[PDB]
Amino acid sequence: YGSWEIDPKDLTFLKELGTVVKYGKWRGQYDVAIKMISMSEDEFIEEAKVMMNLSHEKLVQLYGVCTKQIFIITEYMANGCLLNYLREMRHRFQTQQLLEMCKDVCEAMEYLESKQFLHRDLAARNCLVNDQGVVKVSDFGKFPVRWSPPEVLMYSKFSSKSDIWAFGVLMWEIYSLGKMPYERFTNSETAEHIAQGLRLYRPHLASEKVYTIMYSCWHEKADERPTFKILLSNILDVMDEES
Numbered sequence: 038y039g040s041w042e043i044d045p046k047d048l049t050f051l052k053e054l055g056t057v058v059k060y061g062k063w064r065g066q067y068d069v070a071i072k073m074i075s076m077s078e079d080e081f082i083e084e085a086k087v088m089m090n091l092s093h094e095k096l097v098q099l100y101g102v103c104t105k106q107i108f109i110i111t112e113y114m115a116n117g118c119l120l121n122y123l124r125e126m127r128h129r130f131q132t133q134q135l136l137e138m139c140k141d142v143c144e145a146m147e148y149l150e151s152k153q154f155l156h157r158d159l160a161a162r163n164c165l166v167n168d169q170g171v172v173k174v175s176d177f178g179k180f181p182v183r184w185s186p187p188e189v190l191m192y193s194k195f196s197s198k199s200d201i202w203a204f205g206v207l208m209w210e211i212y213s214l215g216k217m218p219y220e221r222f223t224n225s226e227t228a229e230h231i232a233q234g235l236r237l238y239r240p241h242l243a244s245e246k247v248y249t250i251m252y253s254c255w256h257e258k259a260d261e262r263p264t265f266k267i268l269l270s271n272i273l274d275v276m277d278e279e280s
């Protein structure tokens with residue numbers, strides 16, 4: 038490509054993470070994740086356009102690519118995926134830590150909103166957590182019914198406000214410590230119940246103020262839902278009030 042092209046001689050593979058993605062070192066000093074690529078050349082080149090043109094502190098940062106063989110090299114996120122990070126009971130989270138996980142994602146989403154980029158799959162499983170516990174959204178490129186507003190499920194109407202909906206569900210995931218949304222319903226029953234105006238209950242760890250913020254993401258009318266800029270302000274206000 039250009040400066041984005043990484044010499045694969047400078048990569049050291051140290052451990053396998055999952056599926057294939059491996060932990061490694063770049064030029065000796067830099068900790069990295071290395072994805073072995075499945076997908077066509079047109080589908081890769083479009084996914085490259087996104088990663089190379091978007092950059093924020095709370096988005097998983099591309100470092101480079103190896104396209105003369107193929108690897109995608111990124112920022113390393115020591116604590117792995119957010120959903121599993123939440124589920125590990127050893128952490129024993131204070132509620133302030135949980136609100137700060139929401140703020141991180143919201144900052145990422147407010148950036149993506151400012152660039153008119155639609156994420157389309159915001160959920161805890163697609164967020165990663167670094168060594169300092171900072172949560173970052175994977176912009177990179179089984180329908181996610183439980184994260185979808187009614188206008189997506191019925192009409193496939195995607196917009197900034199369907200990401201907002203999803204973010205609300207992501208907050209719920211965080212405050213429930215990584216439970217499945219609507220865990221006792223099927224996907225089909227979830228789509229029916231949300232059409233009838235049913236919404237997720239307030240998790241015990243979520244205060245009334247925090248719950249109001251996540252609930253504002255689930256208004257039936259898409260245009261009644263806030264922007265990510267508004268949500269960020271509301272989160273910041275609660276952080277100052279409740280701590």
Ligand SMILES: COc1cc2c(cc1NS(C)(=O)=O)=CC1=C(NCc3c(C)cccc3C)N=NC=21
Nearest residue numbers: 054055070071072109111112113114117118177
């Ligand atoms: C150690 O824990 C982990 C850490 C990471 C991780 C998975 C785990 N383990 S697990 C499977 O969750 O149990 C995936 C990444 C990643 N970026 C991945 C990525 C690359 C390389 C290229 C393009 C797009 C993306 C999203 N940076 N750090 C981690």
